[PDB]
Design a protein around this ligand. Structure first.
Ligand code: WHQ
Length: 346
């Protein structure tokens, strides 16, 4: 009679529509436990994410509402698209949980990063990342927090970005991964579309080095890794800085910065055949153009898509697909609950 049923995965309770069977865990973290399942109605495997009272506080609520709203604005194969959204609760007063359903992928990009990838797969993953970012930008969405843990991949090299980036305080075991954020974000500068190119360069470089490029306890540590490796930025960059942050950055110890042959030596690249020698030099060239502190000097998304390392995959239908409510302010728990509930059941 009832449309739903409940099972215990890990230690969370999943109450899902009966069409979804054989729930197995695949991931946990920030704002959602996730299960794989078989969708008996679509005859395909899916991933199901549980949002446990997303309205419980501002940080959870703004992200839940935003990503439920934004996913109807984008339509692109390298960007999340939902198959279903539902709550097992019946009225607003009973509402607690939201369940999101998408295609089941094969792996997280963190997993792929730990592998040895030929140039064809690396360049195809990066090409798809840039296509998705370009689609987001065309829809007026600048991500600012692109990171591998929110990117998923299938065995055939196809890739999807799962989140929409930045707009806090969390009272939980949770901690935010900040290593892929641009200097604009680290330093509070304001930004344009190519803020996301930095994060792609951080992902790129980690595929080559198999180590996080700019680790650190906080932005303090992080900034130190940035300047130690790329060198202190030019005065032209300093002048963009708010006057207090400028003082801190200018008074940091001055480093000259390593060249990119030394940051990404030949050893890290496939370079036995002439084809692979050439691709290694094209890869390091692209790296040197997106790991650039000053956004005025950093390569754009469009130019990155024309780079010789990337454009071997080009095709008009992928990079330029037709683009498409609103982003809201501070609300109470009660108000967020109703906003999310109403978006859940359009
Ligand atoms: C055999 N397959 C595997 O081992 C793997 C499959 C995946 N995989 N595939 C899809 C997918 C979606 C989400 N998040 C999510 C969701 F489930 C539903 C709606 C929205 C969102 Cl953002 C997560 C959780 O990411 C932290 C992992 C996911 C990763 S490893």
């Amino acid at each position: 009679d009832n449309q739903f049923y409940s099972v215990e995965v890990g230690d969370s309770t999943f109450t899902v529509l009966k069409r979804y069977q054989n729930l197995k865990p695949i991931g946990s973290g920030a704002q959602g436990i996730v299960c794989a399942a078989y969708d008996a109605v679509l005859d395909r495997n899916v991933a199901i994410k549980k949002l446990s009272r997303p309205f419980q506080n501002q940080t959870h609520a703004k992200r839940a509402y935003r990503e439920l709203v934004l996913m109807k604005c984008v339509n692109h194969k390298n960007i999340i698209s939902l198959l279903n959204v539902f709550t097992p609760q019946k009225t607003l007063e009973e509402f607690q949980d939201v369940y999101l359903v998408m295609e089941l992928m094969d792996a997280n990009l963190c997993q792929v990063i730990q592998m040895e990838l030929d140039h064809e797969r690396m360049s195809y993953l990066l090409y798809q990342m840039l296509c998705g970012i370009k689609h987001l930008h065309s829809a007026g969405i600048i991500h600012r927090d692109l990171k591998p843990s929110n990117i998923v991949v299938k065995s055939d090299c196809t890739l999807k970005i799962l989140d929409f980036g930045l707009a806090s305080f969390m009272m939980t075991p949770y901690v935010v991964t900040r290593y892929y954020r641009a200097p604009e974000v680290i330093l509070g500068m304001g930004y344009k579309e190519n803020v996301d190119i930095w994060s792609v360069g951080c992902i790129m470089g980690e595929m080559v080095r198999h180590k996080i490029l700019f680790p650190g306890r906080d932005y303090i540590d992080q900034w130190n890794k940035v300047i130690e490796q790329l060198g202190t930025p030019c005065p032209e960059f300093m002048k963009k800085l708010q006057p207090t942050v400028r003082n801190y950055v200018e008074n940091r110890p001055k480093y000259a910065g390593l060249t990119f042959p030394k940051l990404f030596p030949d050893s890290l690249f496939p370079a036995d055949s002439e084809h692979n020698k050439l691709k290694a030099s094209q890869a390091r060239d692209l790296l040197s153009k997106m790991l650039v502190i000053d956004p005025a000097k950093r390569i754009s998304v469009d130019d990155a898509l024309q780079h010789p390392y990337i454009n071997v995959w080009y095709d008009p239908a992928e990079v330029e697909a037709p683009p498409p409510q609103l982003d809201e302010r501070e609300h109470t728990i009660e108000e967020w609950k109703e906003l999310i509930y109403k978006e859940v059941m359009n």
